[PDB]
Design a protein around this nucleic acid. Structure first.
Lengths: 129, 77
DNA sequence: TGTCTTTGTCATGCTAATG
DNA sequence: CATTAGCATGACAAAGACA
């Protein structure tokens, strides 16, 4: 085992939050700096989850290396379109590339966005809750 | 004894400003003063607000020293 | 006591996108 | 099919007059 184990990640989280506060940065500030300095911005939400370890060990492991560069150095779909989309889903759960292309232009929305919406919708329907 | 959250730059700045307005406006209800303070607070510059942000930051670090294991845990409705 | 008011910060739910 | 990131929303801090 080379990557940080759970206890080590908890310590890094502790350290990271201390340094952030000591330096006077908000979680949002850090998320923004990550994009400006390292090319991958993060939201305030992700920084908050990371500092609280409200993420899986798998996700914390991906993020730690990225936030470590910061630490070292510091030292949308429309409401109406949705409803219609839902109506459509009701009619046909799995529209074809052709059906889809139509629906896109019809709604004046990019094709890929629509293809993905139906994919996400079929997935949500398979959920327990 | 429950631990309360650190006061933010506005709450700290209102604690002393709120009393200043009450002495000059002791018959004004906090509901209206709270509105004028917010209006006045939005007019301060960052340099002028900085001294209040740093103090809130210091109160937050010092607050963390008293309870290093404290966690903000809001109640969901 | 609860009502009614302010700004800033943190955590959560739902949505979108990638492999 | 499985998993990650992000936006908008709700809750909480302190102090005071009014019902």
């Amino acid at each position: 085992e080379e990557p940080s184990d759970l206890e080590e990640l908890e310590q890094f989280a502790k350290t990271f939050k201390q340094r952030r506060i000591k330096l006077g940065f908000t979680q949002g500030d850090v998320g923004l700096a990550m994009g400006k300095l390292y090319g991958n911005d993060f939201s305030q939400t992700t920084i908050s989850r990371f500092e609280a370890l409200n993420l899986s060990f798998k996700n914390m492991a991906k993020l730690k290396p990225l936030l470590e560069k910061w630490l070292n150095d510091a030292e949308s779909i429309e409401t109406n379109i949705r409803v219609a989309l839902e109506k459509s889903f009701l009619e046909n759960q799995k529209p074809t590339s052709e059906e889809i292309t139509m629906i896109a232009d019809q709604l004046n929305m990019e094709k890929e966005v629509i293809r993905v919406w139906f994919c996400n919708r079929r997935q949500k329907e398979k959920r327990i809750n | 004894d429950r631990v309360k959250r650190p006061m933010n730059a506005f709450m700290v700045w209102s604690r002393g400003q709120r009393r200043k307005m009450a002495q000059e406006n002791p018959k004004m209800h906090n509901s209206e003063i709270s509105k004028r303070l917010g209006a006045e607070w939005k007019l301060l510059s960052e340099t002028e607000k900085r001294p209040f942000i740093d103090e809130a930051k210091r109160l937050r670090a010092l607050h963390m020293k008293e309870h290093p294991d404290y966690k903000y845990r809001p109640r969901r409705k």
